[PDB]
Amino acid sequence: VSKRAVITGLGIVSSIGNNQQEVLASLREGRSGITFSQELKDSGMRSHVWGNVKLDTTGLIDRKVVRFMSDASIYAFLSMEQAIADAGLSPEAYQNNPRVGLIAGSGGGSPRFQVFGADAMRGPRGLKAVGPYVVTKAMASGVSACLATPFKIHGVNYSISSACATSAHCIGNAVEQIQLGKQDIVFAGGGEELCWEMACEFDAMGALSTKYNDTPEKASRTYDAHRDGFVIAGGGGMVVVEELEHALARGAHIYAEIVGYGATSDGADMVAPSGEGAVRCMKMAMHGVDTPIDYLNSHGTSTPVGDVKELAAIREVFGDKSPAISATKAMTGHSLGAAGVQEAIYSLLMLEHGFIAPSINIEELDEQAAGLNIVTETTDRELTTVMSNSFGFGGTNATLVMRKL
């Protein structure tokens, strides 16, 4: 028989909380992670906001392992430790075990350290200034390599990259490993650094927010008529995807089962979605799921184009049976590769603690958002089935559907 996959542990470092407790509080309160960045302004950009991680990471991780890591790996690492703790896994349980694996990625590796390495090459010292550690900080697989090694992972070990769907495809791929019976546990998630080196390339396409540099907590404002792009964010998240029989036999806490995973492709435009991909993606995630979506964490990035196409696709999927929607990115900003796992965790906390978090900074709605149930006030509700979406450049789409046992 094909197996079932459940979430038995989570960890997160995000612009709105350094662990799941801080995040739970933020979600209930609609607290913004967005702040003004003197680094973005000093670089020459027109976006001066960001969802930064509010934590000095200097010296938190052992020298011998942190020497290989860029910030994406740092955040994913710290998230992993919390997830291992949450799942109640001892070292003997998950280390040196061929049935325990890890799939975790970033959207962009480390632009900061690819730039460092070249800047140092071109200087007076040459190779001597580069150092022997840039490759592992810059490779696209840094997040998985820098965690699989110190945590003694013996099973699957690789990253998925799919732009801003990255960490949701990681979770989905981890579920398929469980389903195929190849792994008992897979740590799944990702991380993303926060730096002008990569922010400025988004500004050059005019995708970031330019108008609210003086009012940072308002710049990210999904579904609002005067949204002017997304607020870039950094951070990390990790969940423990576990086979159901294995979780039961060890007495684990089960947040939820993953009952659906959709992954589709638009095959259309390189930077704007098609909605058609999203429709099939949510549909394939709901396939065989005999309960309704009680809550839907949208992808919603506060972009002109993005927010509408997803509401359109949402409207086509659900008929007169629409569920509630909020864009937590209105509080958090957009962590890119780490977005999917973080939003999976926000959705899991809404399910565990029976509320719906609000989409904030909607002063004036958008006409296309009519008839839809965009929850803008924290609301207590017994949720049973939740759904989260992530989309990315290149027309890549991911959907996860999560249900209580």
Binding site: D62, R125, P132
Partner: protein
């Protein structure tokens, strides 16, 4: 900070060891847990700290803190 104090701070920060467990006759590899990439980075930091160049031929000969301290003393 003299030659010795600078040399031990470099060694200490990079190998993640308190600057008092850096014995003068400690071996990077045997006593302070350096691996081959630590070896590259340590030689590159020492080179920068004292503007001396350390050929590979010499770097293999430096197995101890004191040999490093002695190498820096006798090149400039």
């Amino acid at each position: 900070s003299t030659i010795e104090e600078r040399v031990k701070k470099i060694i200490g920060e990079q190998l993640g060891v308190k600057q008092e467990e850096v014995t003068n006759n400690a071996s990077f590899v045997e006593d302070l847990g350096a691996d081959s990439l630590d070896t590259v980075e340590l030689v590159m930091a020492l080179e920068e700290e004292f503007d001396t160049e350390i050929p590979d031929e010499e770097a293999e000969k430096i197995t101890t803190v004191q040999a490093a301290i002695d190498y820096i003393n006798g090149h400039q």
